[PDB]
């Protein structure tokens, strides 16, 4: 299939779509869709008392991946920053003190690339890298 489409078989050519947020803690996103077209944008906003870190507006690219950096609303009361939730992923763990961990998993049929588990190190940093949920195609 040409750019921005994926074949239903391994080879009809269906349009690529970027994953929606499973959730977005302490903020909202607009438009709120089940999945997003290539070229479409999603804009993030935080509730009162929170800092928006990462990219507040992200665009869906033709390979099904969002550009920019993962948005997060972080109140800041933690030893490490809020690691956020990559779009397509689920995160277990709601504490960011020294030693605390968080585990990630790609929902739906997305392919996880990166560190499934991270620990809040002593210097205010998370271990490893950030997981990124790829579409099964591409």
């Amino acid at each position: 299939c040409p750019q921005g489409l994926y074949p239903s078989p391994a080879s009809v050519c269906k349009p690529v779509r970027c994953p929606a947020p499973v959730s977005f803690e302490n903020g909202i996103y607009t438009p709120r869709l089940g999945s997003y077209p290539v070229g479409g944008n999603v804009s993030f906003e935080c509730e009162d008392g929170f800092i928006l870190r990462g990219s507040p507006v992200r665009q869906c690219r033709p390979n099904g991946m969002w550009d920019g950096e993962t948005a997060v609303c972080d109140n800041g009361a933690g030893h490490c920053p809020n690691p956020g939730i990559s779009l397509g992923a689920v995160r277990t763990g709601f504490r960011f003190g020294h030693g605390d961990k968080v585990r990630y998993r790609c929902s739906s049929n997305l392919v996880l690339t990166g560190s499934s588990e991270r620990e809040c190190q002593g210097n205010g940093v998370w271990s490893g890298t950030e997981p990124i949920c790829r579409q099964p195609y591409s």
Partner: antibody
Amino acid sequence: EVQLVQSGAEVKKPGASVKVSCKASGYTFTDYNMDWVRQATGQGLEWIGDINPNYESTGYNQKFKGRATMTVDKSISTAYMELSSLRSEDTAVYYCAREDDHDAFAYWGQGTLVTVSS
Amino acid sequence: DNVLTQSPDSLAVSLGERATISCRASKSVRTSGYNYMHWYQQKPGQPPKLLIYLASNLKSGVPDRFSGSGSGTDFTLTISSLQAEDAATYYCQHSRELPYTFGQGTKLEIKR
């Protein structure tokens, strides 16, 4: 070519629960959320909540106080809305409605009448 | 929650004449350069039908006598030349935030 077909009319006593179904066809079911909206006869439209079939994650209007529960069965491209602890004021036509890429409700089920009364 | 107030609640328009319906949101529906306001038509016995998306864009298959304008908290739906099939109730709806909410509806009837 997109079609949303809902289950039939229901009649319920106060306190009971009702579960309305919405079968989707004509598009890739996981491309879009399914939303639910109701309309009391003669009155306006009220959004209930939505569900993302990819994740089975949900959002609800707070006014329903957790009484509404949305689920999906991806194998049959069907969404469900269960509303519990029914009151007479829940008498309404219930719609499933599906967004487009502008987050407008481009497609609507035919409606399901739910009558709640002693 | 955003409250959408439409005016008039009802109006009578002669066939061929212009009909204008307003929608005022209590909070702005504009973000990221788009106005997240949509308009629907509803007739008795049927679900609403989408007419206008993102304030001013005609949905495919809708006649071009329908148009929409406005930004921020102020919006209008205009039928430039009313036809008998246009008698219906019209609703605005925002998609700026949750809960999605609708206006109360404006009933458009044929004047005689």
